[PDB]
């Protein structure tokens, strides 16, 4: 069983140079991400190795969806978990304007325009978490089954909460390819920051950047 009420509870439970501040917030949220995942139905029941695989595979997308939704009422910028607001101009002045603008135009603005709610956000993150294509999974079919239960619950929720919007479910799912692309580009940047060594990178963030 995959009740949307439980997913919502998981979201509510974890709610609290420019690049250096952004990376600091990322490290901080990685700890919170683990607590979030444990609250998602059936995640803690999967074998430990698979739990590790799913988190290492989706942490970028999971964190991006979270700060993007948290920034829906912010104009031309994002709100970091540390409480700091980062404006588009600041990101541009730091050399990461292109990827920052993609987050604003492809995610933040779209979430705002459709008024994506916390339940929907939680379900999309749960779908991202339960990625059956993650390499190394001991039982990909089990993870696929969990993903299917999540999107079945999400579709039911959308039709009941927003009956006047027949395309809302599809619209929500169609933000996932953009999230995937942005997450990959973000990872590339992080690898570069690590390579250059000019940006402080905390221990957990650093660990996520280590080889499998």
């Amino acid at each position: 069983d995959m009740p949307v009420e439980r997913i919502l509870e998981a979201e509510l439970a974890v709610e609290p140079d420019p690049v250096t501040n952004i990376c600091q917030a990322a490290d901080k949220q990685l700890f919170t991400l683990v607590e979030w995942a444990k609250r998602i139905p059936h995640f803690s029941e999967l074998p430990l190795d698979d739990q590790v695989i799913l988190l290492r595979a989706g942490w970028n997308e999971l964190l991006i969806a979270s700060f993007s939704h948290r920034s829906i009422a912010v104009k031309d910028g994002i709100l970091l978990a540390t409480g700091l607001h980062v404006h588009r101009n600041s990101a541009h002045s730091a050399g990461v304007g292109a990827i920052f603008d993609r987050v604003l135009t492809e995610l933040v603005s779209k979430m705002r325009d459709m008024q994506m709610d916390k339940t929907e956000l939680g379900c999309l993150r749960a779908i991202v978490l339960f990625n059956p294509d993650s390499k190394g999974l001991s039982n990909p079919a089990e993870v696929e089954a969990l993903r299917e239960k999540v999107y079945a619950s999400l579709e039911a929720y959308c039709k009941h909460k927003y009956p006047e919007q027949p395309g809302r479910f599809a619209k929500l799912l169609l933000r996932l390819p953009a999230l995937r692309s942005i997450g990959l580009k973000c990872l590339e940047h992080l690898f570069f920051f690590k390579l250059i060594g000019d940006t402080p990178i905390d221990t957990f963030l650093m660990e996520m950047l280590e080889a499998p």
């Binding site: 683990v34 444990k38 430990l48 739990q51 957990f204 660990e207 996520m208 280590e210």
Partner: peptide, 11 residues
């Protein structure tokens, strides 16, 4: 490997 992550998932 994945030292921190394993410890945190320990619960």
């Amino acid at each position: 490997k994945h030292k921190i992550l394993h410890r945190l998932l320990q619960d």
